[PDB]
Amino acid sequence: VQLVQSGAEVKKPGASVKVSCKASGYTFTSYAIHWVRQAPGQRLEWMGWIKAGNGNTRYSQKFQDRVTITRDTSTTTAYMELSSLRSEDTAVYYCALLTVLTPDDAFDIWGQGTMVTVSSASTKGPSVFPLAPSSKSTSGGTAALGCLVKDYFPEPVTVSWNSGALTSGVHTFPAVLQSSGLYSLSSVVTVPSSSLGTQTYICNVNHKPSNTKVDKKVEP
Amino acid sequence: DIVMTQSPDSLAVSLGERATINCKSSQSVLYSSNNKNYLAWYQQKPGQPPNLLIYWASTRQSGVPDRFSGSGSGTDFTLTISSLQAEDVAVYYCHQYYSSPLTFGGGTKVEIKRTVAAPSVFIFPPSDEQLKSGTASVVCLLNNFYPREAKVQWKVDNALQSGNSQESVTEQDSKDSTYSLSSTLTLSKADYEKHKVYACEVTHQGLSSPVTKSFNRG
């Protein structure tokens, strides 16, 4: 019972964006998929729904002119196209099965979200540098190590460790904005210091807007 | 437009204490013929999508722990966490599905009130790979501290710096309720070569004086 959205994108003012929502794990044609957006600091904001079966749509009055929701029943996928993009349109765009409350079933499922940035600035993939453990990165039997993801645009980058197997001790910091206009963030994990010689520690860095998938081993 | 208003905007309580969030809808959410309130509550941890907690004003969704309960009818609604656990840190939204357009409240941020914890300070010299590109980032790390207020100062050759660092603070930890902060000093390669001592000085309530971490570029 899952919804999987396409990756984050950057567009030029006046251009269009086309987000997608792939569904699986349930009867696709039985329910309606909504589109909600979360701007930075603003409350969640409903845009419209589409009936997955027959394709009928209703749109919020704020987005009547510029939104179009569609669906392809064969691939189990819904789409949301927003045209004439403006600065206010920088937000995370979710698709969700909002409160499916039927006599037979009751569930609620959201896609992970698609960050859309409206800017004339160019996409740029990050450089991935190691933050190596050392004598100045240890305290009381643990060692701190991480990755520095510098100089990318737009947000976001995702950082995992050892492909998701290492999660304890992990802190991924919010991105900082540099005067250049490019973003930068750090991801750090604290691990046992005794076993730095036998264990392997890899940052997995994903920046979909620039098709960047990087695996950086971090060694002393 | 049913305007959903929540009170308060921020709530802070100790671990285990009762927490209550109030939602007021601008018109009635009750349908008297079926006696149902068209109101739901969502939880949103940072970096995740919202999570449905309560629907029909008071019906809890399977999977949601028992300590979450909803009540109220008409235009006044309450979400109660009878015993706040660390992972309950999040923003909580009420939501009405009574009228079009669907609307959400402005969210209520719930925070934990925690004992003081001094930070663990670490510093990282720039990797050699980054210096090939002519730039040098010096990263200072303050791990797992409380309260969130912390001051970081950079020193190069014992000289206080200004204008060349940036900071970032995590969300509150779901497990121990602490924060973490990373400060990054960025310099050109040449400027970094010009100096020997790079130091990070941290001031926090759990420390009786500032702490300094430093390395020599060699």
């Binding site: 309606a32 009936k51 209703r58 499916v100 | 009228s99 079009s100």
Partner: peptide, 10 residues
């Protein structure tokens, strides 16, 4: 009173 078309999944 409630609009059945606000959310068709209810």
């Amino acid at each position: 009173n409630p609009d059945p078309n606000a959310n068709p999944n209810v």
